[PDB]
Paper text:
In this study, we identify a β-galactosidase with novel substrate specificity from Bacteroides xylanisolvens, an intestinal bacterium. The gene encoding the Bxy_22780 protein in the GH35 family is a component of a gene cluster containing SusC-like and SusD-like proteins. In this study, we found that Bxy_22780 specifically hydrolyzes β-1,2-galactooligosaccharides. We propose β-1,2-galactooligosaccharide galactohydrolase as a systematic name and β-1,2-galactosidase as an accepted name for Bxy_22780.
To learn more about the binding modes of the natural substrates determined above, the ligand-free enzyme structure of the E350G mutant and the complex structures of the WT enzyme with galactose and methyl β-galactopyranoside (MeβGal) were determined at resolutions of 1.91, 1.86, and 1.94 Å, respectively. All the structures in this study were tetramers based on PISA server analysis, although the asymmetric units of these structures were found to contain two, one, and four molecules, respectively. The electron density of galactose in the α-anomer (α-Gal) configuration was clearly observed only at subsite −1 in the WT enzyme complex with α-Gal, whereas galactose in the β-anomer (β-Gal) configuration was not observed at all.
Numbering used by the authors:
A (entry chain A), B (entry chain A), C (entry chain A), D (entry chain A): 20 to 509, 538 to 550
Write the structure that this text describes.
Amino acid sequence: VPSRLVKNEHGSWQLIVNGKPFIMLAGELHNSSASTTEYLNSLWTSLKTLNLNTVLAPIAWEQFEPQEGIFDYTLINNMIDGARKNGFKLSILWFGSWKNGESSYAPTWVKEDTKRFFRVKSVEGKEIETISPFCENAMKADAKAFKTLVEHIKKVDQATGTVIALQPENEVGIFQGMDYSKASLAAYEQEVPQALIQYMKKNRKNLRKELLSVWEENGARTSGAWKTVFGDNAWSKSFYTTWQYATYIDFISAGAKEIYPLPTFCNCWLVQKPDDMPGVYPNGGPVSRVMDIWKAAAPHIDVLAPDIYLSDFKNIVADYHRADNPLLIPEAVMKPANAFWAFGEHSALCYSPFGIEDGADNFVFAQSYKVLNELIPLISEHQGSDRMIGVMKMPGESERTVTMGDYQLCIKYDAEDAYGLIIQTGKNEFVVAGINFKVYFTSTDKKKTGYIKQVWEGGYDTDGEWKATRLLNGDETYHNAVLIAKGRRTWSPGIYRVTTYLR
Amino acid sequence: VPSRLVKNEHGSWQLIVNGKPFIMLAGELHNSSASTTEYLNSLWTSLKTLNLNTVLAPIAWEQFEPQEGIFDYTLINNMIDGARKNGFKLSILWFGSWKNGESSYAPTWVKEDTKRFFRVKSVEGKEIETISPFCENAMKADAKAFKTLVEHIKKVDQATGTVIALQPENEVGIFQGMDYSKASLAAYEQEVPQALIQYMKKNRKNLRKELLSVWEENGARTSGAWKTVFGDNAWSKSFYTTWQYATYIDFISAGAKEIYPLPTFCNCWLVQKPDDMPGVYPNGGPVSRVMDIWKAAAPHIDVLAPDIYLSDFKNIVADYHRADNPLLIPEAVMKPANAFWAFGEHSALCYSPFGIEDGADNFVFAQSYKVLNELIPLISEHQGSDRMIGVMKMPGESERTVTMGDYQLCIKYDAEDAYGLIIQTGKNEFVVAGINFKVYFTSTDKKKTGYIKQVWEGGYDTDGEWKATRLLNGDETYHNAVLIAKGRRTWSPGIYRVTTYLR
Amino acid sequence: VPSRLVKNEHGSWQLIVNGKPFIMLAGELHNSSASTTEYLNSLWTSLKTLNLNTVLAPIAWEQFEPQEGIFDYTLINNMIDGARKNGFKLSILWFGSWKNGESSYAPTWVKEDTKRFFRVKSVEGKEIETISPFCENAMKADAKAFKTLVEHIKKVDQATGTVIALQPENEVGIFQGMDYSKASLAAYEQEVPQALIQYMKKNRKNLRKELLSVWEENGARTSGAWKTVFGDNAWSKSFYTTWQYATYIDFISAGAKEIYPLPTFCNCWLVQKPDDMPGVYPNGGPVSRVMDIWKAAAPHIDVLAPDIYLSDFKNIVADYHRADNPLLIPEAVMKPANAFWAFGEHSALCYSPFGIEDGADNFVFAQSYKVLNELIPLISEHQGSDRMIGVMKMPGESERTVTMGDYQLCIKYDAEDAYGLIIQTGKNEFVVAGINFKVYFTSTDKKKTGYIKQVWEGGYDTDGEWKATRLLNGDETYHNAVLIAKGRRTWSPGIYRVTTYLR
Amino acid sequence: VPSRLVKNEHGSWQLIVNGKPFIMLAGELHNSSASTTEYLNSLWTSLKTLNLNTVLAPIAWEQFEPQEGIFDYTLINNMIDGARKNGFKLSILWFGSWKNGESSYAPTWVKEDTKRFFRVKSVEGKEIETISPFCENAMKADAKAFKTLVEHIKKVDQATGTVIALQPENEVGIFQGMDYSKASLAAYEQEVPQALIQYMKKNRKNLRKELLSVWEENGARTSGAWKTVFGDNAWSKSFYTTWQYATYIDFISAGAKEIYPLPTFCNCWLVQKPDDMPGVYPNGGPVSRVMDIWKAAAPHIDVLAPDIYLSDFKNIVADYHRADNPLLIPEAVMKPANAFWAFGEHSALCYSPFGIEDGADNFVFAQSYKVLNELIPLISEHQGSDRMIGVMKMPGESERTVTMGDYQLCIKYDAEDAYGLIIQTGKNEFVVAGINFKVYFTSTDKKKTGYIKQVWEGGYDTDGEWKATRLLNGDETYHNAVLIAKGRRTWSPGIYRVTTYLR
Ligand SMILES: OC[C@H]1O[C@H](O)[C@H](O)[C@@H](O)[C@H]1O
Ligand SMILES: OC[C@H]1O[C@H](O)[C@H](O)[C@@H](O)[C@H]1O
Ligand SMILES: OC[C@H]1O[C@H](O)[C@H](O)[C@@H](O)[C@H]1O
């Protein structure tokens, strides 16, 4: 396969694409932007102006299998063609059974057969425009379509590897405490799957407090029905609903994994505010609260991926990033700081603003992606090490101090919009990227005096070779008292090589 | 003849031009803009930028017959030539005896002979710059000139049919309770024409309340002088004045109809405010109040056409549009909403902003006319059916609900300027055109649940074939909860094909 | 001579240039703009953009005769050359003895010999930077230089006639009650010249009140010294000072007139405010107060020309324009209204903004001059007749009514900046030029009704032929109720041909 | 040598470059702008737009001798090459031991050997990032590197003379009362060098009051230790610290002077406010207070050069300019007035805004340098004479009166930004350059009347020949009452030739 997840020596998961470490400097199209060849093809030049290396774009079941057993390859073919012609990799979003909780992208022939493909019912007993995750017929039909899609991708792309990941479904779940379908009501009475129980036993001290605290308040049982093991409440309802979604979607993924295994992720509509109960967000989706349930149920899903539109960026990405869950953000705001934070602080695989085609001639964002592209080798090499950090000022913060081997770095912000990353490349050498901040280097050991030795500004050329544009000194470094990450001027992030010394 | 009015199966009158249904996406030039070949010819490129299919332009008697019996074809010839070269049809306005009530376009040789062509007198006894409608000499001279014009048009245009309609005179009437000319005073004493009496008898329950109520308050007589049948008052004065105008102008039209019958309309200066008595507007013109008198008197005039500059657009067009009177608006404001309302709600033949050459690079208006042009076949096919409506928000309105077969449509406005039209093309299919509104589809029958199935955005190509630009779903339809008529973006009206379904 | 003043049948003086009536649509350069060939030549294209037919430009004595008896033809030659190449006539300003009262343009060899060329003395006894008009040596030297200049112009221009007028000196006089030079003090005691006395006798009832009232308060004597005939006061001082200037400058002109007689004018710095006594303005200059003295003394000076920078334009031009003194304005503001007023109301020979090279791309002024150029034949033909008037609104005015044969014209202003002219070309025909006003035509005789018959907008082509651009009617003339002088649109003055009629 | 300092007949020092008087119309690059060939080469076209004749640019020791005994000629070679190709001379700044007091440009191999190259110690005993001026090893290493640099310049530039001056080090000194290094503490106890004593004896009445007053308050001794001759205080500390710096740097210069003597200057960080004690500015630098110490100690340094960023420009330049110290300003603000003041009032050798590459398309500054370039021959010829002055209005000033031979000049300012210069070129002739001021010429002798005779505006062509663009008179000189230095218009300084006369 031309795309694979591989753990490095620091325990960090890396994307390896066509034999090399690859980070998705990505963007996701608006939902309807890949619905015709002509509309998509109008976008490619726009996208290139932003220095993307990867485009996230949907394939809709309703278009792909417009009558049962009849498959239309037009949109996937043109999508791969245009990606190749314009220098992009693709992550394919499968808008099948569910997108933002609902079934609006299911085929006309699925929608119209509510007997074969039964719907979620509300507490009021109303069938909604959502296929129930307890419907096995729907599971099989989606799975067959998805597999056919992936089979096709292998048949047209197994050598080039334009397609480097897959997202089955999109932000699944129900805006309800539970599905009131008869099948759902019967499932709630069943025994808790052993696979869940054993997962909880084996990984107890690393479990989500939201799961552990509910398990333990019911006596941490190793058998029983859902209401026995987890009590009769909103959480028990959320847990078995989540188990169902992860299980349905795991089967869908399994079918693809058997014929052409690519990195696979499912994305979640986040718990928007901290008191929100399941169903105010999509109940069943892979929010961090239920991460353990998804891991237990869905081993053919590699990553649980947050869609982040909220301002509390650093806390959110820290919440989703775990040893068993690399950070992968398929939908976000068009804010360069976020990118630098995700890649530098958390070794992310992907950063991707949503509706990216809208953001053409966001010059600063484009130049940010240019600089990140220059740094992909260096970032890759340091994923998971304590020698790489991000930099991102949040309102009300003024400085960040960190230890890097022999040195203490004091990062002070010169403007509200201040961001970058810092890599220690040698005992007395650092690469600093970004804008609107300063770095003071001092000695960890107080018997010694540490100082900047020399500073160069520059970039990496197309061969990956460092080229200095200036040796910064005098005013430009306050006579080596400080690194000023002023940025590249046309202002956008710069790259600075700093040597230090101890006397 | 290459232009004709024909009633379809729904009882709606259609313009059939060169064998096909035609709707005038029109504009009228400023009054003096066709007075030389050079000034007119300077306008054509401007007009094309607005996507007109039809130009309304005057021929002035004073220029056409500058000495009695001598005819100058220069302006009509160049007008037809330029229309052909720039892809426009023409409706010819005949500024003869009267324009905005007055006789300023009559030839020098008519103006200067007030014995042969006697004037209206005021109550003070003053002769004004208006030829009296009781002057038979003036009737004959105008009629002869008009016929000569039309004879010429046949001789140069009978095959191509560049000229598709005729407007004899322009907003006729007097700013007076009545003409005080001796002939006028003698006419007021005469017997009411039987043709009027019989019209009133035959069409009593469909008569204008303004006419019926006056007739019935005088005892609904079937014989007598004007003051007998209608009482001695302002209304009796207006009625016999109107009879005179319609009769004079009918004779003028009759002469043309005999040699080359084209759709013929007379236009009115509207009753500007509801209390206004005859003479505050031109007394004698085809305002809706006297529509029955004009129909009775002038069978060679096909349509009575309002000139609408007032904001109460929907009430006005509803007032002029009758089973015997299609809506045809030769003069209006340059407001796209009005166009969509007139064509969609009332199956109008014509919408035409006045001084159109001024409005070049009114981009939104131009794109509106582009979209209407795309829809002419579909609009044509649905003229007079209960499956086509207009959409136009007025201040203080928030929604419009309508029944369309099995579905209830709730139209909600997203901005003040919200307009379009809606056609049901199938039991479960709709075409929605416009901007700044949303449509919710639900089931008429409350035992059933109705929903959007699929939504496409697109347009009709030059062959008249539908071409989708996107399948709208997800954010673009709130996951098929609603049709968002956002418009085509460059914002101007869009076209959306919606399929629905019942479960 | 290729330029001459000739009185027409209405008593009006006309400029006849190369055999045809010519009106100077003129501009005067800044003072130093003709001081090198290179600076002047940089201006010609600018000037052409303003549609000038005539440029007023200086020749400075100091440059022309830089050593006594040595003459430098460079600047006059290049000036005539560039005028020819760019389609302009020239009026030559001779900055000799005096410019704005002073002698700053006299040659270095005149300035430095205050014995040979004695100065004006102040009352304090100080010699100033002004050559005394009582210095005969200075008179002769200036006269010889001026004649040499004109001799040269004949020698290079007698056939083409690029040079069409001459201005000897520039705004002469002293900022003093009188010259206190010994020669001046001796002149004040002399007998009043008979030529003055006889002029006063012969033209008594047409004399300036300022002169007559002083003469008559001293007993209207026919002999005596200045203080006898005019009393011992400021006026007597001004009169004999003025006599001296006019006499000195007449001799200068006489020398030129003998070899090559061209229209010759002297220009005055105006009495700036009504109480100002001689010497607050240049005492001796041809202000209107002393017009009779200049006429008496200086028969080789054809015209006394006001330099008008003040806002009271209509009163000023009425004050300078007399039967023996055509209106000629060599220096004015760049205001088109002023031009139309001067040419239309007062049949002026010249209108000329000062520092004209500054005003390039004053579009409105340029288009004004274009329209005047079109009208020169028609204006010429009506100079001095009661069938041509100007139009110019001043603050606080609202209308102007005039009688033109059978018609009464009511001119009503539609904006503050409203101006043009009106010519009756036939008993029932008028040409109206301008902008921002309206004209109502009614019958002089109240037994008759007068009205507009027809209105055309247009212009005169390069052959001088009228070409209509539109027949204005309907909205454009309120149905012949009024002429609307809206202007040519791109707004600037238009030309309108109006026919009228009486019934 | 192709560049040399030579005293003219007025006692003024002139730069003679390639055989001719040369004034540096200069600019200094930002500190890091000559750190790569590519960054420098990006600037040349920018610099040419400003009409510089000279660029000041650094060579950094750390780059030039990156390992001991290994020399890298890349940056000096490319610098000379680009200067030649773009028409500039160079003054080379040697950023060696010290730049703005500190040692940030010393080689890595100097910084890292604090035993061989010992640092300054603070009063707290801390070694700082400054090489001590008492370190002989550092003196020798710097001197050897500097000499190698100059040897190279001779080897590549001895014929062309692109390099016309040298600045060893940059704003030297310590932010301390004294160096607390053991060597520094031992030096403070030593005998005052005789060379200082004798200098003070010989030049007593011309000594800086700051030095003389301290010497005399300690009894004006001719022998003793520093604390004996100058007391035990801050001044004694500053004096021996300054002696040390001047001595160290003199040795560095001496090595170069032996093989290739060019004009050499050292620049100072100014006493920023009048109460500031040594160490608030760099203690040891050539501020004016210690000018005598630098002259005594450092005969191989030709000029002590102020870096002026403060608004008190006229007082500062008067303070640094002495008979033994021409004015040379290598760092200043980009303000044209300053340039005119320095060159005109004080016959400066150099005016140079800092960060000049930033100021491209400062049009006014560029045109100022154009005009100065035109005047270099005339300025050169009048350096040190009482016939050349500067003109520069400071806030709160309104006029300046000066005597120039027979004439009194009253300079009155017409705007805040008013500046230029004035040269008397003959008994009755003046050249006035500048903008926004006026000059009134009157007679020194009150028995005589002095006046402007004639005024020309113009410039010097590429051959150095005067070319008048206009003879200014009339309005342009108020009829020779005044010279108006209005400027060249596109507004920037003009050049005006004025002749005057006495009667
Ligand atoms: O723009 C809203 C956004 O909401 C979620 O993040 C979905 O995953 C996206 O497809 C889109 O609907
Ligand atoms: O612009 C005013 C307008 O008034 C009426 O509608 C007329 O029919 C038009 O010709 C025009 O006069
Ligand atoms: O601009 C002022 C103006 O004043 C007078 O009118 C002069 O005749 C002109 O030459 C000029 O000096």
